Design a protein around this nucleic acid. Structure first.
Ligand SMILES: [K+]
Length: 96
DNA sequence: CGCTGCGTTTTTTTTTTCATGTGCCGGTCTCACACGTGCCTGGAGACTAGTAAGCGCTTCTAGTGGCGGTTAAAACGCGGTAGACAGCG
């Protein structure tokens, strides 16, 4: 009956196994991938949070995220993150 | 006395060994990844409801030219000096 500390480690595995199905990952290295996601979570949730505050909006939409992601991410990483982002919202709304 | 070159003795530079740490192969042991199982909480469903936000229309600002005039500011160039870069101890 211990606290119950969540993480992202099961999703990192899931994606590790998609991209390098034969490869694995040490505790320390997952620990890093965990920090990484929370870090770029907070970074985006913030810039979005601002964008909204700055334009007197109460709702963080996908539009805010896309701006956050343009702002926070470099040239080529940005173009793709937007795309997989765009792609995922589009796939979700059609799906159901 | 002064020089001059030429065999000597040393110095510089080359060639070959040589002792060193490299990263390279293949067998043992450890504890960490991965699985799994079972329980529990947090996401999903769905429907309710109340309000944010987006679009059009109303106004009027504050942004974009554009027009000459004068002046302060750039341009350019020449002339020399001190500071950058190498070389010696
Ligand atoms: K205006």
């Amino acid at each position: 009956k211990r606290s119950r500390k969540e993480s992202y480690s099961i999703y990192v595995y899931k994606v590790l196994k998609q991209v390098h199905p034969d490869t694995g990952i040490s505790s320390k290295a997952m620990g890093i991938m965990n920090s990484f996601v929370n870090d770029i979570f907070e970074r985006i949730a913030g810039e979005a949070s601002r964008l909204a505050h700055y334009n007197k909006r109460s709702t963080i939409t996908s539009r805010e995220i896309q701006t956050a992601v343009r702002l926070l991410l470099p040239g080529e990483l940005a173009k793709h993150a937007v795309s997989e982002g765009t792609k995922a919202v589009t796939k979700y709304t059609s799906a159901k």
